[PDB]
Amino acid sequence: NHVIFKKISRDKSVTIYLGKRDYIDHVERVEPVDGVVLVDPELVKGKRVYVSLTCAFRYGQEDIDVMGLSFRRDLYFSQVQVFPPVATTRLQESLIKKLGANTYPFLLTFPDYLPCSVMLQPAPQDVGKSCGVDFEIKAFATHSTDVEEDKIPKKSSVRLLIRKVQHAPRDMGPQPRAEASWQFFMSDKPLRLAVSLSKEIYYHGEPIPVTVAVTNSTEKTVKKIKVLVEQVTNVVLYSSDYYIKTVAAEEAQEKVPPNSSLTKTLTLVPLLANNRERRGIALDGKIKHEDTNLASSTIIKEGIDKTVMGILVSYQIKVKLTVSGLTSSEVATEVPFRLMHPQPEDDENFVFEEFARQNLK
Amino acid sequence: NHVIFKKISRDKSVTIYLGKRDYIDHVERVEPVDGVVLVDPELVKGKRVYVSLTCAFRYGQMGLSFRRDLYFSQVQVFPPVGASGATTRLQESLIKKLGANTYPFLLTFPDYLPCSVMLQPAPQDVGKSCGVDFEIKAFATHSTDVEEDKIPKKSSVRLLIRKVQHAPRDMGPQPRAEASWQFFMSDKPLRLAVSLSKEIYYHGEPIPVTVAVTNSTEKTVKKIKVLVEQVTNVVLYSSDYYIKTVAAEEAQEKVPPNSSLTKTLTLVPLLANNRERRGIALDGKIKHEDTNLASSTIIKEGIDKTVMGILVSYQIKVKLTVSGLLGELTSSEVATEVPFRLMHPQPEDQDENFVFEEFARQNL
Amino acid sequence: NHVIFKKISRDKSVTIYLGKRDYIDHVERVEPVDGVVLVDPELVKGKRVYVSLTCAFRYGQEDIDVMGLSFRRDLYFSQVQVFPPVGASGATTRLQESLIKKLGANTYPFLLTFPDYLPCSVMLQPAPQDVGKSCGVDFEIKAFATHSTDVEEDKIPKKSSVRLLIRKVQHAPRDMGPQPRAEASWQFFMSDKPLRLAVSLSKEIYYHGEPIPVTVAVTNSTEKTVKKIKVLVEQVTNVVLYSSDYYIKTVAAEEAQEKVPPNSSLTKTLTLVPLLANNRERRGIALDGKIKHEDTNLASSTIIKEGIDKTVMGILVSYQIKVKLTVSGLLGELTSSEVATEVPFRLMHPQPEDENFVFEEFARQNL
Amino acid sequence: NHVIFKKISRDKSVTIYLGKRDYIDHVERVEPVDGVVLVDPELVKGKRVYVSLTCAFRYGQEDIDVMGLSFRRDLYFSQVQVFPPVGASGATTRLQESLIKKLGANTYPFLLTFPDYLPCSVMLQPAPQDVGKSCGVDFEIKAFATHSTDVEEDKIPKKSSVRLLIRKVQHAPRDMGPQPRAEASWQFFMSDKPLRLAVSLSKEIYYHGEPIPVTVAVTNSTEKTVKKIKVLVEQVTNVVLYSSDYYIKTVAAEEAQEKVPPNSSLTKTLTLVPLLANNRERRGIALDGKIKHEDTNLASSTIIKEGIDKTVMGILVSYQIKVKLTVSGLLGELTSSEVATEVPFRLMHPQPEQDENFVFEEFARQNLK
């Protein structure tokens, strides 16, 4: 029972139908956008209907008694003609049959140099403004005087805010543990801290087994071991904004006394759910929407300037050790890992629905 | 030569006299309603005359689909309460002129109310007629039976006054906006800066919109269009949203590649500019002559906006049409908004002469 | 005849002598730093004296009401051993042989070369209105002595050291092609009548102090009047390390009140000279030295070399001619339009080409 | 039990009594000098006794015989008459009324007030390595008798005079500056990676003897190791009259034992106490008295008042926390004191707040032995 998403123009001349709201990027390639446009042939007589896929980075928010700063960079734009009619998919053939002979198909493909859906609304403490990477499917009708005069009337247009969602690639090699070790000499006795994860890539919702191995050869005591999942966000267009936020924390009060060692495996799950405060964090949608999660790890492709990603999202495990004196010292170290959605898979009946996403409040 | 407004009951037992139809809200405080009621003492014998100020939000042309009362206050004019002495010069004067059957009333506004806003929608618009009315009503009540008191319609008289938004002392900081675009496969920015002279403008006052296009692209800015958009948000019963152009100006200059053009267009947002007066937030009925565009809503600190009923705001929109763009960004998609407030000008700091007139407002 | 610059350590164990304060970058190559170190052999017994050339970008200034923010990136560092002698610096120069003979056999030579990936001396102290902080690219020649327990403690004692703030100065290259006129034209349609503005300079490269002949050619086919023609030399500064600061400042202006009436045209040649002298306010401008020093000028145009990330220049300085036209409104409206266009050009120093020695303190002359 | 300080003239004709040796400057105002002069009425018959407060900057050594050996700028001078008694003759303060009652009717009061444009007691005797000479700001209370000869020439004998070297001592105001904070980062040659050093003190003003908690936050993103973190209290002295002498001296040093390895960060709070006690060598340092005296400390931070030319302070004393990082693999590019940041702070004395009983004592200050 396939749920199809429809939206209709104001003047009811153009209606657009999509198979999905969210389109999978599995690194190797990206799911193309196959849909259909249903035209009212009376209202489109001597007109031309096109469909456009735009990816755009945006920056800046409305502010009272504060100067309005706005910025947009288009990162990809591609347009095709649906009407008049000039391979197909099963989804289209089926939707055409169901909807009539006024239904016309469109296929818009993503390239490999784009980021995935990333958004950020800042907290009061944060410097820097609202920014994000949107993806817009837009169907719209033009006259033959609308071409060559650059006119696209609003009532004849219909836009949809789809998501490019980051999934792990289908064939992956076996994953080496994400492991590092440090040696903090204190009076020329070493305090050795090793940190190790099971794998390099974790899935949203999947728990992360963090193995910590303190080897205290010092005369000092490790009073406290804290383990975090930090999300590091770097806005890399317009404004060099930097956010780092804990999205998961576990704090054992294990003591490692002088001339002893303690191995230990904490399990963290970095979730948007864990954060009442959803601001200052890179999400893959709006705070209000239900289907919105933490943004996946940015995957910069070989020889692609990172700045064309707009927002850079990375995750890391941070281990903090509190260490006694004879006040006290605190050392900390980071271990990077990638967080994305699980790898993808290998008549029909249609229930039609408004594209508008489900809120939580 | 003070023009006084009178209206008389059907049974001619109660007549009400007001100094004004329109009462000034200058944010700090609101002009109280000082008037007098003239009773025919024969026809109000063993009766009680009151005067009430009601503010109410309404929705629908259910006969009337929905009403929320936002403020109600009533006072007794007859029989006379206490001193019986006037509170204002206008009253003392009206009493002297009209006789000893004249009784004064003072009804005050609070600070949590909106100002007169009305909206009759166009055919294209979804959502219905709605508005915030203010009613001064004088009426007589008697008892012919021990078990109940009665209020005849014939003994009552209602007046639809306006709460009109006038400027405070304070003005916001000089409104300013910047926006930049970088179109697909273009290394080069198109910068649009917009500046108004001040934050508050008066109805009828012209608005000097300074536009500063800095085209570093290989594309040409074919057209600069400047609008005054009025944004209306019905915030009781139905979440209706209207946005309408009430002024538009289209500069003739084009901005060629690798050039910049500063320029100052002047707009005047007026109800006069709009043949179609429907779909727009007004401060009165379409038919009445003294009716203008609604003033900017001024929500007071820590007052839930929903108790305003209709939210009216104004903004300058600057749209740039750009050559070679195949549908990526359009005129209203290559655009910025700059907010400003629109209200009426600030107020000011032996007997006089009175010409009496029917309260009924002048149609067009 | 030849003015030599000396500076001496606090403990008087190490003295350094340089031919120049300012070393020429003529794009093709950069003048190497040839000097000598005079050691007091009693005070350097069982010690090692080195000389280091450091180029470093710096950012941030002292503030009593503001938290102290500082940042340094070393862009180049190279060190050589002068004592004990090992011939580290290889073959010698005439300047050294002469200085050795004049100063004694306790004099030892050093040669430190610049590479091609460095910027030239650029500095910037901001004005009150300006958002970002003090920043610049310094060049330091430093001679210093270390014990064999000084390598063993990673310590380099201050009294035994001597630093000199030299300048890398941007000169035009010796072989240059013939220089095309730097010219562009624009066509500002106003009601579909064009206003054509052509701007032309004599050449692409000008020298500090050289006058710039800006030819403006307005061809007004509109119904509007050009009320005023203003011509500027704007200096555009982009801090491209730590903080993305942007400054644009007029360093020369000429404003004819020539009127070009409807359906007429006016050619005209204004002459501007972009000088630090023209600017009372010396803050917000990219200089090649400190505001106080006399020999300080406007910074030369940054010359980014082929396939060198611009960010390793630290501060990017460029110059342009800006032409502003004020244009009358059709309704005699109280305001009017203004159009403007930029023509880029580069600004640097002119191209390059017994002995007797008067010794002098390196310290630069203030105003 | 109030300890009063007396000194007597050689000829025993004039004795001066002070409540204190040290007078408090708390920025807002300065403690005036209230004392009394006890005259031997036989020895001051037909004479006039005055008391003078002089503040003077000096440079060099004190004039021997006739030779001018020292440069002197008077920064303030004020004189009053104690004998014969002037007008009311009545005490101004309880201390005086009490001292008069205790000492007899040959006791006369004096009040000499400080203005706001003066520095506080600063002195400096240089070390062998130091260029520049002995200098300081002295405060002298002097009582002396003057008489008149047969030729018209009034005389001031030394034997009839008594001088006291009081101290103007810097105590804290109500106000404190904002919590001192510094950040510095380095990116070493051929290194894409920053070494971040942040430094934070608890407050802006510290008291002499109070410990200073210096919080250091090294964030080593480099492949190099921070081998040593050294934390100093440096005292910066600027002689701003006659000779532009500049001294900077460590008066406290602490060397944390933690090293910061590649790709780690270490927060840490060292505690320093800048004291004269910590310094065997007491030369090259700005003190508030002579090296020999016991009550002598480090000089307080100079507090230049708004629109008062700093040069009329004579010596400028300031304090700062310096944090030096020693870093592995650096071949001379940047050193310990070249990979360093400073955080300024002010150092002064703590804020201020029927008859009594008097134990009299020689003004002469207690030496160390």
Ligand SMILES: O=P(O)(O)O[C@@H]1[C@@H](OP(=O)(O)O)[C@H](OP(=O)(O)OP(=O)(O)O)[C@@H](OP(=O)(O)O)[C@H](OP(=O)(O)OP(=O)(O)O)[C@@H]1OP(=O)(O)O
């Ligand atoms: O001839 P068209 O119908 O193809 O073009 C019009 C259409 O363009 P757009 O969609 O913005 O691209 C209107 O938007 P719309 O369909 O949503 O709504 P409406 O048609 O206005 O109800 C727009 O209204 P807005 O931006 O002012 O609100 C209007 O502007 P303007 O002259 O001010 O107004 P009117 O001429 O309507 O009085 C345009 O006229 P030009 O650009 O002058 O040719």
Ligand SMILES: O=P(O)(O)O[C@@H]1[C@@H](OP(=O)(O)O)[C@H](OP(=O)(O)OP(=O)(O)O)[C@@H](OP(=O)(O)O)[C@H](OP(=O)(O)OP(=O)(O)O)[C@@H]1OP(=O)(O)O
């Ligand atoms: O409830 P409100 O007012 O706070 O938020 C609504 C508003 O969002 P906005 O202004 O972008 O913040 C609408 O934008 P709009 O008028 O610009 O529409 P256009 O795209 O221009 O046609 C949006 O589109 P529509 O349904 O009206 O077409 C609508 O649905 P939805 O697509 O899901 O939201 P988004 O993903 O677009 O934010 C949002 O509601 P919810 O469904 O609860 O989220």
Ligand SMILES: O=P(O)(O)O[C@@H]1[C@@H](OP(=O)(O)O)[C@H](OP(=O)(O)OP(=O)(O)O)[C@@H](OP(=O)(O)O)[C@H](OP(=O)(O)OP(=O)(O)O)[C@@H]1OP(=O)(O)O
């Ligand atoms: O043409 P119409 O019918 O639409 O307008 C009339 C209608 O008011 P309407 O506009 O609908 O509100 C009458 O209402 P009614 O009799 O139902 O009774 P109530 O109003 O309930 O007492 C009203 O009479 P009344 O009030 O004294 O009884 C009368 O005066 P008035 O209120 O002063 O004028 P407005 O400023 O209100 O227009 C209006 O006159 P005209 O504008 O000249 O035609």
Ligand SMILES: O=P(O)(O)O[C@@H]1[C@@H](OP(=O)(O)O)[C@H](OP(=O)(O)OP(=O)(O)O)[C@@H](OP(=O)(O)O)[C@H](OP(=O)(O)OP(=O)(O)O)[C@@H]1OP(=O)(O)O
């Ligand atoms: O080793 P460092 O570089 O970290 O610190 C040294 C440095 O301290 P400061 O920068 O003032 O904090 C010297 O000061 P400075 O700049 O004047 O002279 P330098 O030219 O540097 O000698 C100081 O000598 P000084 O002040 O008397 O001249 C010296 O002490 P001292 O016993 O004399 O030992 P050495 O003179 O034999 O080294 C310190 O050594 P330690 O305490 O062992 O570390």
Ligand SMILES: O=P(O)(O)O[C@@H]1[C@@H](OP(=O)(O)O)[C@H](OP(=O)(O)OP(=O)(O)O)[C@@H](OP(=O)(O)O)[C@H](OP(=O)(O)OP(=O)(O)O)[C@@H]1OP(=O)(O)O
């Ligand atoms: O007040 P400031 O900062 O503007 O200028 C002074 C400052 O310059 P700074 O910017 O730090 O280099 C001193 O640096 P310092 O004490 O840290 O010592 P080091 O430099 O580490 O040795 C410098 O000392 P020193 O170098 O001779 O020892 C001194 O002479 P000098 O370099 O010849 O003059 P400039 O040509 O540098 O201005 C400068 O004095 P003035 O004569 O008034 O100008």
Ligand SMILES: O=P(O)(O)O[C@@H]1[C@@H](OP(=O)(O)O)[C@H](OP(=O)(O)OP(=O)(O)O)[C@@H](OP(=O)(O)O)[C@H](OP(=O)(O)OP(=O)(O)O)[C@@H]1OP(=O)(O)O
């Ligand atoms: O070289 P000198 O003359 O300038 O300084 C001396 C002078 O100091 P003084 O002016 O009082 O401060 C002597 O007092 P004095 O009455 O002759 O002098 P005046 O009456 O003032 O003229 C003082 O002796 P004593 O008689 O008070 O016992 C003697 O030692 P000490 O008590 O430790 O000194 P203080 O504790 O009092 O400072 C001082 O010696 P050194 O400073 O070490 O050379």
